[PDB]
Amino acid sequence: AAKIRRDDEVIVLTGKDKGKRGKVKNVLSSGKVIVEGINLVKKHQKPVPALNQPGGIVEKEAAIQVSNVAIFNAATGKADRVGFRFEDGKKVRFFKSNSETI
Amino acid sequence: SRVCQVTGKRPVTGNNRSHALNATKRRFLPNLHSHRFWVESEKRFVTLRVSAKGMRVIDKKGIDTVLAELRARGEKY
Amino acid sequence: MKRTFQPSVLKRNRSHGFRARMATKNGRQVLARRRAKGRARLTVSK
Amino acid sequence: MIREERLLKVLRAPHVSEKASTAMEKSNTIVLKVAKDATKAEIKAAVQKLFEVEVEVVNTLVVKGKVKRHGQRIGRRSDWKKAYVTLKEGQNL
């Protein structure tokens, strides 16, 4: 079963700035997630064909690896491993850490 | 082809082996002459692939038994 | 000079075209060796 | 009786041509696409049943397929039928 997708928030493990709940703006078929309120990239972009404009940059949020981010545990402000399909009843995520959702 | 069908013979390899004893080929070929018959098993006359000293076998087996064997060998008469 | 090779494809098609090879025993083997090499120019000649 | 309506695989989308798209495209002549398999034998009656109008003259051609695009190895247009059709009135849905 696949991890992260787009509905959950992440705590971040990769070499980017940490200490905030990364909100997933979009998910990519390249194995990456785009997270809001975490990091920025400059990008000035190609100028328009006519003719004189002011200076300005795009300043947009960065994509990071979907395999080095871990989801927020909704209990102690940290990240936790979750597990798949609980041992009793309906088909649901195991939520190993405290056995509770959201 | 060089096939006689009645005695089933085929050409065979063979070496010359005559003086001055060279290892050259010579071969051996059997005979085929073909012949017309009355058989009584048919209202018509028939021609069969047969050979010299091979018609001697028809006297052993009986003409209707050779007519049936050449039929089992796919012959056209 | 003339390098033994004229402009005419009718002279090629009648020997090396698909119908000129697929109908002959050895030409239908050229087509099999072409396929066995992986060569895209299977017979051309048109 | 006689024929079924499967004959009516006739005429495709309009295209641009200086012979039509300048002053004639809603009053005399229009340049159309044509399917890879379609009649040239009953085309005068096929339009009379599918579009319910009459055509006086129509010729079909291909000119040439271009091959020089997106190369890499160069991509082709192929031959496909185009027709110079005298429908004299416009049709859009």
């Binding site: - | - | - | 495709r12 309009p14 859009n92």
Partner: protein, 63 residues
């Protein structure tokens, strides 16, 4: 449209092509050239369902 109808006989389902879809089947040809229909569901609904009656017409010679 169904693709299987047990003992209901397919000889009466050819009418779906020869009369009931008639004068609307493929009608966007020549009359629309933009691709801008704004009914991207309808263009998917006028596809594949007409093939299920063709899967059912496999047994049409039965009596």
């Amino acid at each position: 449209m169904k693709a299987k109808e047990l003992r209901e006989k397919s000889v009466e389902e050819l009418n779906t092509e020869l009369l009931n879809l008639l004068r609307e089947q493929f009608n966007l040809r020549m009359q629309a050239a933009s691709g801008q229909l704004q009914q991207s569901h309808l263009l998917k609904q006028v596809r594949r369902d007409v093939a299920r009656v063709k899967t059912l017409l496999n047994e049409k010679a039965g009596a």
